[PDB]
């Protein structure tokens, strides 16, 4: 069966990838974000949703998970969804300034603020994508993210979390945290994923060189044909 | 029906993408190379090939098409193929030095030279990927590419060309050029694709913002579900 990583194991795999294999940051981020988008479309495809086009709020954090979120949003657009992004804290680097402009001229909107009540979120959006915190998260959940997460736990619409349900401890989880319905584990799942009890768990990030998989004994399952995601069960 | 571009139209679409939309070079190159790999796997999937794992020679040029080739090779590896790269002329930039190392630690080999007879190519490789020249090609086909193309036209195994059959005039074609069996048109097809008479023509590069498609009246067909390629016929 497939292996679930420690924060330490995953920080290590990630640094091989950029330092040894010399994969570039935005290369992998593109592929990670595509997988997210691809998991969401397979779990909640347009035909099955009530709105044509189905609506989605993508909430992006201040670090790389936020980045994956921006990329996901843009592929969601192309896959037939009507996404909206809340990106309250934006790092000033070209990486992120470029992902912002791309989404803008796709006509994907950026909310100036978070709807403060879960019911309004539920009414506006058929799905919320949690791209706030990922693998390297150590916090200390500070504002404005505490109250975002507090709105999220009152939602009736599904939450799709990228890599790690934000607010959960990367290894241990959080019983009183948000309880997503879809989780996209990128590269390899993290021990906190054994606490996941939603209906959909996909593996994404089809870019792990087989010698890395053999080295860290990841026992990655075989993605089918040309797919960039695989449903874990 | 879908539109076929002039060199001038495509140089323009490409420069919007990087200058206006601020898509990054390696972002799109990743997605282009993934589509190539995905077209090849759907046209010539492992189960249908005689070797397990099916073998492939990817021939990379000195410019961006070569880049797409390197990316294709690496996804081909993950998709279940045993690729080999001939990259005789290598630009010294991180972009390309990184794509080279990635392939190396995937255990994808780089030929020191081209097999000089088509029969040897046919015996070693079940498929040849032509990533030599693409859209911005103006040449003046110089060495060592003249003799590569001259080996290629004597092949019995299929050739898969990325974007433009190398040696063909980007608009007009070339009746006495190489005659690929698969063509992957990236972003949008080029007028030379109306001269293509092989069995497989896929469109790839699922990243065109709809307002660009509407502006340059590309009439892009609808890629199905989450696929990054579409078969044209
Ligand atoms: C292990 N690992 C991850 O868990 C992850 N999540 C997002 N990018 C990631 N990368 C690049 C990674 O190597
Ligand atoms: C139009 N066009 C192309 O035809 C192409 N081929 C490879 N990259 C490409 N890009 C980025 C592009 O914009």
């Amino acid at each position: 069966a497939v292996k679930y990583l420690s924060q330490e194991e995953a920080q290590a795999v990630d640094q091989e990838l950029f330092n040894e294999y010399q994969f570039s940051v935005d290369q992998l981020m593109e592929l990670a974000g595509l997988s997210c988008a691809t998991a969401i479309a397979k779990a909640y495809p347009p035909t099955s949703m009530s709105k044509s086009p189905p609506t989605v709020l993508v909430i992006c954090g201040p670090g790389n998970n936020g980045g994956d979120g921006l990329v996901c949003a843009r592929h969601l657009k192309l896959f037939g969804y009507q996404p909206t992004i809340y990106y309250p804290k934006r790092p000033n680097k070209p990486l992120f300034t470029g992902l912002v402009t791309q989404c803008q001229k796709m006509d994907i909107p950026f909310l100036g603020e978070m709807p403060p009540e879960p019911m309004m979120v539920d009414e506006l959006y058929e799905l919320v994508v949690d791209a706030i915190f990922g693998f390297s998260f150590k916090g200390d959940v500070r504002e404005p993210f505490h109250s975002i997460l507090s709105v999220l736990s009152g939602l009736t619409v599904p939450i799709a979390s990228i890599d790690i349900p934000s607010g959960w401890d990367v290894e241990k989880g959080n019983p009183s945290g948000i309880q997503p319905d879809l989780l996209i584990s990128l590269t390899a799942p993290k021990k906190s994923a054994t606490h996941f009890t939603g209906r959909y768990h996909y593996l994404g990030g089809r870019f792990v060189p087989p010698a890395l998989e053999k080295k860290y004994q990841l026992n990655l399952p075989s993605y089918p044909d040309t797919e960039c995601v695989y449903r874990l069960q």
Side-chain angles (χ1 to χ4, degrees), chain A residues 5 9-15 17-18 28-29 32 64-65 68 134-135 162-163 185-190 207:
Chain A
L5 283 28
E9 287 179 325
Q11 279 172 355
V13 147
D14 171 279
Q15 284 291 68
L17 285 177
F18 298 113
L28 296 181
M29 178 164 299
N64 285 323
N65 201 246
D68 297 329
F135 68 102
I162 302 183
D163 217 21
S185 287
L186 300 174
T187 309
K190 277 52 86 165
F207 45 65

Short mmCIF file of all heavy atoms in Angstrom, two decimals, chain A residues 5 9-15 17-18 28-29 32 64-65 68 134-135 162-163 185-190 207, ligand 1:
data_model
loop_
_atom_site.label_atom_id
_atom_site.label_comp_id
_atom_site.label_asym_id
_atom_site.label_seq_id
_atom_site.Cartn_x
_atom_site.Cartn_y
_atom_site.Cartn_z
N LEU A 5 3.55 10.47 4.30
CA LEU A 5 4.81 11.10 4.70
C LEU A 5 4.74 11.96 5.94
O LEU A 5 3.69 12.52 6.26
CB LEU A 5 5.33 11.97 3.56
CG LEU A 5 5.99 11.24 2.41
CD1 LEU A 5 5.44 9.82 2.27
CD2 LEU A 5 5.78 12.08 1.17
N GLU A 9 9.97 14.07 5.84
CA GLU A 9 10.14 13.27 4.62
C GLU A 9 9.76 14.08 3.39
O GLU A 9 10.50 14.10 2.39
CB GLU A 9 9.31 11.98 4.70
CG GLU A 9 9.90 10.96 5.67
CD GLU A 9 9.09 9.67 5.79
OE1 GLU A 9 7.85 9.69 5.72
OE2 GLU A 9 9.72 8.61 6.00
N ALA A 10 8.62 14.77 3.48
CA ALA A 10 8.14 15.57 2.37
C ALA A 10 8.99 16.82 2.12
O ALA A 10 9.24 17.14 0.96
CB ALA A 10 6.67 15.93 2.54
N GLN A 11 9.45 17.51 3.15
CA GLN A 11 10.40 18.61 2.93
C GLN A 11 11.62 18.10 2.15
O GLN A 11 12.14 18.81 1.29
CB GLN A 11 10.79 19.33 4.23
CG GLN A 11 9.72 20.37 4.69
CD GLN A 11 9.96 20.99 6.09
OE1 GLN A 11 10.89 20.61 6.81
NE2 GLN A 11 9.12 21.95 6.47
N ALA A 12 12.00 16.84 2.39
CA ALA A 12 13.18 16.21 1.76
C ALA A 12 12.94 15.83 0.32
O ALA A 12 13.81 16.02 -0.56
CB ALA A 12 13.61 14.96 2.53
N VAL A 13 11.79 15.24 0.07
CA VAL A 13 11.47 14.87 -1.29
C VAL A 13 11.41 16.15 -2.11
O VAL A 13 12.00 16.25 -3.17
CB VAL A 13 10.15 14.11 -1.34
CG1 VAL A 13 9.42 14.41 -2.62
CG2 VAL A 13 10.43 12.62 -1.14
N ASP A 14 10.75 17.16 -1.57
CA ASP A 14 10.57 18.43 -2.27
C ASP A 14 11.92 19.06 -2.62
O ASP A 14 12.13 19.49 -3.74
CB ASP A 14 9.64 19.34 -1.45
CG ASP A 14 9.53 20.80 -1.98
OD1 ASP A 14 10.43 21.64 -1.69
OD2 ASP A 14 8.51 21.14 -2.63
N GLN A 15 12.86 19.06 -1.68
CA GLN A 15 14.18 19.65 -1.95
C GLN A 15 15.06 18.85 -2.91
O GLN A 15 15.85 19.46 -3.66
CB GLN A 15 14.96 19.91 -0.66
CG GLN A 15 14.47 21.16 0.12
CD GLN A 15 14.78 22.48 -0.59
OE1 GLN A 15 14.22 22.77 -1.66
NE2 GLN A 15 15.67 23.29 0.00
N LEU A 17 13.72 17.41 -5.42
CA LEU A 17 13.13 17.70 -6.70
C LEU A 17 13.71 18.98 -7.28
O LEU A 17 13.93 19.03 -8.50
CB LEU A 17 11.59 17.79 -6.63
CG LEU A 17 10.74 16.52 -6.53
CD1 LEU A 17 9.25 16.89 -6.40
CD2 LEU A 17 10.90 15.66 -7.74
N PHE A 18 13.97 20.00 -6.47
CA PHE A 18 14.42 21.29 -7.01
C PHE A 18 15.91 21.42 -7.04
O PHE A 18 16.46 22.15 -7.87
CB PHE A 18 13.85 22.45 -6.20
CG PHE A 18 12.35 22.51 -6.23
CD1 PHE A 18 11.60 22.28 -5.08
CD2 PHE A 18 11.69 22.78 -7.42
CE1 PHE A 18 10.19 22.33 -5.12
CE2 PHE A 18 10.26 22.83 -7.46
CZ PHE A 18 9.53 22.60 -6.31
N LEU A 28 6.66 22.38 -11.64
CA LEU A 28 5.89 21.51 -10.76
C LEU A 28 4.62 22.15 -10.27
O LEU A 28 3.60 21.49 -10.08
CB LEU A 28 6.74 21.12 -9.57
CG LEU A 28 7.94 20.30 -9.94
CD1 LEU A 28 8.72 19.93 -8.68
CD2 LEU A 28 7.47 19.08 -10.75
N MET A 29 4.65 23.45 -10.07
CA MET A 29 3.41 24.10 -9.58
C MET A 29 2.35 24.04 -10.66
O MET A 29 1.18 23.89 -10.38
CB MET A 29 3.70 25.54 -9.20
CG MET A 29 2.47 26.34 -8.73
SD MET A 29 2.94 28.00 -7.78
CE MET A 29 3.93 27.08 -6.29
N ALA A 32 1.04 20.58 -10.48
CA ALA A 32 0.27 20.33 -9.25
C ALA A 32 -1.08 20.94 -9.35
O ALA A 32 -2.10 20.33 -9.02
CB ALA A 32 1.01 20.85 -8.01
N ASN A 64 3.00 28.69 -1.12
CA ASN A 64 2.93 27.86 -2.36
C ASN A 64 1.63 27.17 -2.66
O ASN A 64 1.29 26.94 -3.85
CB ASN A 64 4.04 26.82 -2.32
CG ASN A 64 5.34 27.42 -2.61
OD1 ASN A 64 5.40 28.33 -3.45
ND2 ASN A 64 6.41 26.96 -1.93
N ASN A 65 0.93 26.82 -1.58
CA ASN A 65 -0.40 26.25 -1.66
C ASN A 65 -1.30 27.26 -2.36
O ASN A 65 -2.05 26.91 -3.29
CB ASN A 65 -0.86 25.90 -0.26
CG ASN A 65 -1.99 24.84 -0.21
OD1 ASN A 65 -3.13 25.17 0.20
ND2 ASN A 65 -1.66 23.57 -0.48
N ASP A 68 -0.64 26.99 -5.92
CA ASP A 68 -1.31 25.85 -6.53
C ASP A 68 -2.75 26.22 -6.77
O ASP A 68 -3.34 25.85 -7.79
CB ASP A 68 -1.23 24.61 -5.64
CG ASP A 68 0.20 24.12 -5.41
OD1 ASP A 68 1.09 24.27 -6.29
OD2 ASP A 68 0.45 23.56 -4.31
N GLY A 134 -0.40 24.43 3.22
CA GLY A 134 0.08 23.14 2.72
C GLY A 134 1.14 22.55 3.61
O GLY A 134 1.05 22.68 4.83
N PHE A 135 2.18 21.93 3.02
CA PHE A 135 2.97 20.91 3.75
C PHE A 135 3.97 21.49 4.74
O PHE A 135 4.32 20.85 5.73
CB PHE A 135 3.65 19.87 2.79
CG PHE A 135 4.76 20.42 1.92
CD1 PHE A 135 6.09 20.21 2.24
CD2 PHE A 135 4.47 21.13 0.75
CE1 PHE A 135 7.12 20.70 1.43
CE2 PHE A 135 5.47 21.64 -0.06
CZ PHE A 135 6.81 21.42 0.27
N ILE A 162 -6.38 21.29 -1.05
CA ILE A 162 -5.18 20.98 -1.76
C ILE A 162 -4.11 20.59 -0.77
O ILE A 162 -3.69 21.41 0.06
CB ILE A 162 -4.68 22.21 -2.53
CG1 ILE A 162 -5.76 22.70 -3.51
CG2 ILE A 162 -3.35 21.90 -3.32
CD1 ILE A 162 -5.32 23.90 -4.38
N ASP A 163 -3.68 19.33 -0.85
CA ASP A 163 -2.52 18.73 -0.12
C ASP A 163 -2.85 18.41 1.34
O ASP A 163 -2.73 17.26 1.78
CB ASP A 163 -1.26 19.63 -0.21
CG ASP A 163 0.03 18.83 -0.34
OD1 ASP A 163 0.00 17.63 -0.74
OD2 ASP A 163 1.10 19.42 -0.03
N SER A 185 -3.97 14.95 -2.54
CA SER A 185 -2.65 14.81 -1.91
C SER A 185 -1.64 14.98 -3.07
O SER A 185 -1.74 14.26 -4.04
CB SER A 185 -2.48 13.42 -1.31
OG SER A 185 -3.21 13.12 -0.11
N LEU A 186 -0.67 15.91 -2.99
CA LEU A 186 0.24 16.19 -4.10
C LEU A 186 1.53 15.48 -3.85
O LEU A 186 2.04 15.49 -2.74
CB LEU A 186 0.51 17.69 -4.26
CG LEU A 186 -0.74 18.54 -4.54
CD1 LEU A 186 -0.44 20.04 -4.54
CD2 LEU A 186 -1.44 18.07 -5.85
N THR A 187 2.04 14.84 -4.91
CA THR A 187 3.25 14.05 -4.88
C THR A 187 3.05 12.76 -4.13
O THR A 187 3.14 11.68 -4.73
CB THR A 187 4.43 14.82 -4.30
OG1 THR A 187 4.56 16.09 -4.94
CG2 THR A 187 5.64 14.04 -4.53
N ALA A 188 2.87 12.86 -2.82
CA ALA A 188 2.55 11.72 -1.97
C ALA A 188 1.70 12.23 -0.83
O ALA A 188 1.83 13.37 -0.41
CB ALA A 188 3.76 11.11 -1.44
N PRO A 189 0.85 11.39 -0.30
CA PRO A 189 0.02 11.83 0.83
C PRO A 189 0.82 12.03 2.13
O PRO A 189 1.92 11.49 2.26
CB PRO A 189 -0.98 10.68 0.98
CG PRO A 189 -0.60 9.67 -0.13
CD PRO A 189 0.78 9.95 -0.50
N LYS A 190 0.28 12.80 3.07
CA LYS A 190 0.95 13.14 4.34
C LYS A 190 0.16 12.46 5.44
O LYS A 190 -1.02 12.22 5.30
CB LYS A 190 0.99 14.65 4.54
CG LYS A 190 2.15 15.41 3.83
CD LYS A 190 2.35 15.16 2.31
CE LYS A 190 1.50 16.04 1.40
NZ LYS A 190 1.99 16.02 -0.06
N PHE A 207 4.83 13.58 -11.36
CA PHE A 207 6.15 14.01 -11.83
C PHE A 207 7.25 13.40 -11.03
O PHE A 207 8.38 13.88 -11.12
CB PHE A 207 6.28 15.53 -11.78
CG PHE A 207 5.75 16.17 -10.49
CD1 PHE A 207 6.37 15.93 -9.25
CD2 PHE A 207 4.64 17.03 -10.51
CE1 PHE A 207 5.89 16.49 -8.11
CE2 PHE A 207 4.18 17.62 -9.38
CZ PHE A 207 4.78 17.35 -8.17
C1 LIG C 1 6.59 16.17 -1.45
N1 LIG C 1 5.94 17.34 -2.06
C2 LIG C 1 4.65 17.76 -1.64
O1 LIG C 1 4.02 17.16 -0.73
C3 LIG C 1 4.09 18.96 -2.35
N2 LIG C 1 2.97 19.68 -2.29
C4 LIG C 1 3.04 20.69 -3.22
N3 LIG C 1 4.22 20.65 -3.90
C5 LIG C 1 4.90 19.60 -3.40
N4 LIG C 1 6.11 19.17 -3.76
C6 LIG C 1 6.85 19.87 -4.82
C7 LIG C 1 6.63 18.03 -3.08
O2 LIG C 1 7.75 17.59 -3.38
#
